[PDB]
Each structure stands twice: as C-alpha cells, then as structure tokens.
C-alpha cells in the first residue's frame, strides 16, 4: 500500500536531483514560510564537498523573488519556515556555474554544501546606508 509522504532521503526541490534540501532543525508551530519579494535575512555558508569553506555570510540579506542570491538558496528560502535550519546541496551550476566564480573564486562543476537558516523576514531593509544604484 501507500502511507503518504515518502522522504527517505534528501528532498528534490527541482526533481532532477542536483539541487536538494535537508532540514537540519525544524521551526516552531507558529513560524511559517516567508513571501517572495521581501527582505529575507539568513545564514549561508559555502563549503567544498570535501570541507573547504569558501565563504561565510552571517548576515545574508536579499530580495526573495529576484534571484539576487544563489539558485540553491533563493529556491530554498521559500521552502523553509522562519526559524528552521535547512541545508542545500546543488551542483555548481546552481551554485556559481560551470564557469566558476571570481571572488570568492570557485571551480566549475564543483558541488558546494550550503547551509541556509531563515532567521527573520520583513519588508524593511537590514543594511542601512546601502542599496543598488543606476550605472
């Protein structure tokens, strides 16, 4: 027969298998998934499949719904409730690309372990005296 939710292994966000998600720590019953188009602040940490931390962003902020961040992070944020620590493992393609990065630099086709943590989601900006400009 069939029980219902079949989650023996990581969760397929896209379905292919590249970009996956693993809830490390679930949030409270009061929390809930944020909205696309608001200021979401989480903690993303890039690390080589081996264990070579490439970067560490404690206060990562971006505008959900604008792909202003990694394709494995912006596609996971809206897949986790505020206060729930979830990890994501996608191929470089979704991370930086088959071409690599600049600074920090990263090798192509080189998967990277990223740990997403939804802290708070609001409309108001977090980083004062900061923002994009025309030029």
Describe this structure in words.
The protein has a single domain (10-123), classed as Roll (Chitinase A, domain 3). It contains one helix and six strands; from the N terminus they run βββββαβ. It has one helix spanning 92-95, and strands at 11-12, 20-25, 39-48, 53-63, 85-90, 112-122. A six-stranded antiparallel β-sheet has the order 1-2-5-6-3-4. Strand 3 (39-48) and strand 4 (53-63) form a beta hairpin. The relative contact order is 0.25.
What's the CATH architecture name? Roll
Assembly category: monomer
Q: Identify the overall geometry.
A: globular
Helix content: under 10%
Q: Could you give a short account of the major beta sheet?
A: 6 strands, antiparallel
When the domains are counted, the total is: 1
Taken as a percent bin, the fraction of beta residues is 25-35%
Helical element count?
1
The CA-CA distance between the termini, in Å, is 60 Å
Order of helices and strands: EEEEEHE
The CATH class turns out to be: Alpha Beta
Output the radius of gyration.
16 Å
Question: How many strand segments?
Answer: 6
Structural class: mainly beta
- What fold name stands as the CATH topology? Chitinase A, domain 3
Strand order in space, largest sheet: 1-2-5-6-3-4
